[PDB]
Each structure stands twice: as structure tokens, then as C-alpha cells.
Amino acid sequence: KVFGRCELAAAMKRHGLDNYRGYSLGNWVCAAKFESNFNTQATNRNTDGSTDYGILQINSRWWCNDGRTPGSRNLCNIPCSALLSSDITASVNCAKKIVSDGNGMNAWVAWRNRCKGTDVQAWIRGCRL
């Protein structure tokens, strides 16, 4: 599923991301835009052999199992394929785990380079919810 901007903002609000660890909704919508272009099916291989999965491009080195990332962990206890569904629950729940670890939203290089220190609230303006 390729989400619309306001559709994703509403779904992210529904599933608990607004103000999660002090990150207002716009942060999450902005990150998703530059990570996946709002595409739940997005995958991208990295030079280290891991892959990033889904609308928030969650990485197999630590967070999910894809059966091909040597020496990796599965801290969200999910197959990485679960992160590709139209239902964003697994991606949201796993992202909550990731952002609780120290660096906050800086784990998304896309967030640091494209969203941080910008008008992130702009990504949710004009939306119903």
C-alpha cells in the first residue's frame, strides 16, 4: 500500500506515534516520506548485507528476522516480511522499541538529514486528524 500523507498521519496517530518519546506526529510522517515514500512494500539492501523493510525502513541487523543477515538479532520478534503489510501495526510497534533506545529518532538517518530542524509540523497541516 502507498499511503497518502494525511492517511498515514491519521494511521500513525491511531497506532500511537503522536508524541511518542516526545516526537510529535510530523517527525514520523517526515521520516516515512524520505525512508519509503510512504510505500509499505519498500525494501532496500545495505552494503553490510542487511535490508531495510517497510514504511519506516526497519533494519534486519537488529530488529527483525529475514533469514539472510548473518550475525543479526530479531529484537522486535517478527519476520521482516511482517513489516511490508498494509497494516502498519508491526512497523509502528517495532519503531516504538527502536526510538526508546538512547539515540531517539536519529536511528533514522533520513530523519536526521531531512526532517530534524525543519518544520516537521508542515507534514500534517491540512489533514483531518
Ligand SMILES: [Cl-]
Ligand atoms: Cl532500522
Ligand code: NA
Ligand atoms: Na535479524
Ligand SMILES: [Ru+3]
Ligand atoms: Ru535504522
